[PDB]
UniProtKB/Swiss-Prot annotation, chain B:
Chief location bin: cytoplasm
Keywords, in A-Z order: Activator, Cytoplasm, DNA-binding, Repressor, Transcription, Transcription regulation, Virulence
Repressor recorded as keyword: yes
The name this protein goes by in its record: Nucleoid-associated protein EspR
Record bears the keyword Cytoplasm: yes
Role, per record: Virulence regulator that has both architectural and regulatory roles. Impacts cell wall functions and pathogenesis through regulation of multiple genes.
Organism annotation: Mycobacterium tuberculosis (strain CDC 1551 / Oshkosh)
Residues within the DNA-binding region(s): 37-49
One MF annotation (Gene Ontology) recorded for this entry: DNA binding
Gene Ontology CC entries for this record: cytoplasm; nucleoid
Length: 128, 131
């Protein structure tokens, strides 16, 4: 996956409660406050793929804004490991998965093991 | 109704980045420093322990801003309600156990998933969690 896709993936998956995805402007602004200068056109270009190969410092500033290791942009193994965590940040906001998953919070370790067992049974009764 | 220490500690406990754990007090001190905002490390420890209370407006702004939430969370008691529900979903959905269950139940048809939920409800009544 490209820089643009990884960058945009952070924009789409990493953000605060009570609101939605960060905007490019919020990022330019936050960088400004740490005394870092980045142009909106440049950020835009990085997001769109009209410029590529961002410098180590540009990458470290974007990674610091989202609060993740820069290795996310440059290392494939780590990218995938962390992308799994981001994936969950999506599936968790699902309403269908909230229903089930949620009520299980509150059961003791032992009782959750029986839920896992019931699930395995429903799996076989289907595929799977 | 919740004190200021409880609302702050909740933020530490539930709001942190993917692929790691809760932020530490020092991380917050560090960050504000990078923004040009000065805050005392032992002071912060006392807001958290409730030794000191009634924070200044500017103090609540700096902290809210770090966690990237509206300051109204500490003041406007109705917004605190709205948000603490979302925080509750965060704590809930990032818990390993619930996650192991949701990812295993994922892919089952709608009718089978209603069944997983029925078994959860049964154990909750049986463990005394519901009554």
């Amino acid at each position: 996956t490209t820089f643009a896709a990884r960058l945009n993936r952070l924009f789409d998956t990493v953000y605060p409660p009570g609101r939605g995805p960060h905007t490019s402007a919020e990022v330019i602004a936050a960088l400004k406050a740490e005394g870092i200068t980045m142009s909106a056109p440049y950020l835009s270009q990085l997001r769109s793929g009209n410029r590529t190969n961002p410098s180590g410092a540009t990458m470290a500033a974007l990674a610091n804004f989202f609060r993740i290791k820069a290795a996310y942009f440059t290392d494939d193994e780590y990218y995938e490991k962390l992308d799994k965590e981001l994936q969950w940040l999506c599936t968790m906001r699902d309403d269908g998965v909230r229903r089930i998953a949620q009520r299980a919070h509150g059961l003791p370790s032992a009782a959750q093991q029986k839920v896992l067992d019931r699930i395995d049974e429903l799996r076989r009764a289907e595929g799977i």
